[PDB]
Amino acid sequence: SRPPLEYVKGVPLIKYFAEALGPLQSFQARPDDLLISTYPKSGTTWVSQILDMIYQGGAPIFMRVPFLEFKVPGIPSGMETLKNTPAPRLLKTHLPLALLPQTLLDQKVKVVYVARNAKDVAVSYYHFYHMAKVYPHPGTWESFLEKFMAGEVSYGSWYQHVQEWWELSRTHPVLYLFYEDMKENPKREIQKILEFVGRSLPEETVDLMVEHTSFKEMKKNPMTNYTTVRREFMDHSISPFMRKGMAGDWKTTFTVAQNERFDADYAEKMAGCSLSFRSEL
Amino acid sequence: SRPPLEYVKGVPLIKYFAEALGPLQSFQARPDDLLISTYPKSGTTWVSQILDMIYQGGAPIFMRVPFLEFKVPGIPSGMETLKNTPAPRLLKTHLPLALLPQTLLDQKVKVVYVARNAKDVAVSYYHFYHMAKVYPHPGTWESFLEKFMAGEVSYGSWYQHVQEWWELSRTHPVLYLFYEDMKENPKREIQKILEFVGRSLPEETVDLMVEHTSFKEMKKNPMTNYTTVRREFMDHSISPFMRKGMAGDWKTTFTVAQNERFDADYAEKMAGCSLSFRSEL
Ligand SMILES: Nc1ncnc2c1ncn2[C@@H]1O[C@H](COP(=O)(O)O)[C@@H](OP(=O)(O)O)[C@H]1O
């Protein structure tokens, strides 16, 4: 019923996910866990499918890759789904570093992080707010854009999220990937994931993973497109989860006025950062 | 009902497996197939389980690894089971090179062959003849030993089998392994299989494969011990498939007289061969 967001340590989150944090400090990480970390709508489902295939030598995605802080009225908790989970475990989270279960850092769990350009994230997040009913109603795109720029959306600021994890990468095992690089050359990025997780697969098998993990395929696959969930939960008729999967599509939504204001605000928040994003390709 | 063996191109075989050869020249091999080749009771099930785990990133074994020439009164044909089989395929065969579907050689299919010392093979084969009722009754061990030395058992001569494939290894991709080496150092042999099939797995995961593919484990696992099959097919009460899994246990069955005769006969059949087997460890 589109419940307002709950702030936690300065971070606004889905009411339910906020409640799920208590049961969350009990969580104990294993040395062989693989943590998939991302700001919302940055390629989480995409890299999850890739990692899952890899872990199977080549049920829906949300069952195979437990969502750490997950929790919803008529659905099993993220930590629940993780109980019936044998090692090695693939985990998923969008949690900022201030809310991340300390155990993951203490065990040096390998992290595959994916960052996506902020403009495409914003548009993708606006449409998701519409279809996923656990989120407060977004309002107009104009108002949502403002909330997104002020980090007044679920999981907080995108600017801080991509920067903190980028910095964490200096003293913690982290493979920091870019949604755009994955778009441009999927095989290249999958090979980087294989090497990073200490695995190898014949060229032929990787080429097959590239075909099956393409937007087109993943949009048909009911195990990856989230269509098996209930309508009053996610209304694919409003906006499909597998919306467009493009890089640079934000140009058909941002007005010139909004783009000018966003860029100015951006340069100001990404000043001292060495992170470089490309909004096209 | 213990039907006599059928000779084919000079090779005696299970009546049913003989019949299964016709439907067999229709078989078409793919470039990515992986062929597990062995003379009977040489570690086929063992290396099959290992390869299957590898192919899954770490149903019973006979369903997951189709048995090429398989065929039995109340059970689906080997090529049948292979129809519902997606690439990449793991295949199993005990066929001598004269009966091997040419397509496997023409496609350069990777072969993992396992050889075991003849004395342990003989004893293991004698007990298998007893429990598996598709084989003619073995008779006494004394008589079986003689039949085994004369290649008058299913799949013919062991001497020729281990030599021809050893030679094939010079002009065809073949990883020739020894049952004994696998006993002595399983991790070492599994790493050789990984490299050979162009795969890689973290050390920790391989150590886990070594534990689960040990004789003890595989003897409990109903998916690998063949206990789900029907009794009038295989009578585990007569002799369990997972008998002992030892190297050098042939000393408790061979009499000194039989051993002296076997050695003399052996030196004569393995003369010009560079193959070296160790009957202990
Ligand atoms: N295989 C794939 N290739 C490209 N984009 C994909 C993809 N699977 C999902 N996506 C896109 O990733 C976004 C969702 O990411 P997440 O899984 O983190 O929530 C959506 O972006 P759009 O809204 O821009 O289409 C979605 O269409």
Ligand SMILES: Nc1ncnc2c1ncn2[C@@H]1O[C@H](COP(=O)(O)O)[C@@H](OP(=O)(O)O)[C@H]1O
């Ligand atoms: N994991 C394992 N480790 C050691 N030996 C194994 C094994 N799995 C099966 N075996 C042994 O391999 C032989 C059967 O081989 P195959 O699978 O080729 O028919 C039997 O030998 P014994 O009769 O000597 O015990 C069996 O016990």
Ligand SMILES: [Ca+2]
């Ligand atoms: Ca989701």
Ligand SMILES: [Ca+2]
């Ligand atoms: Ca068998």
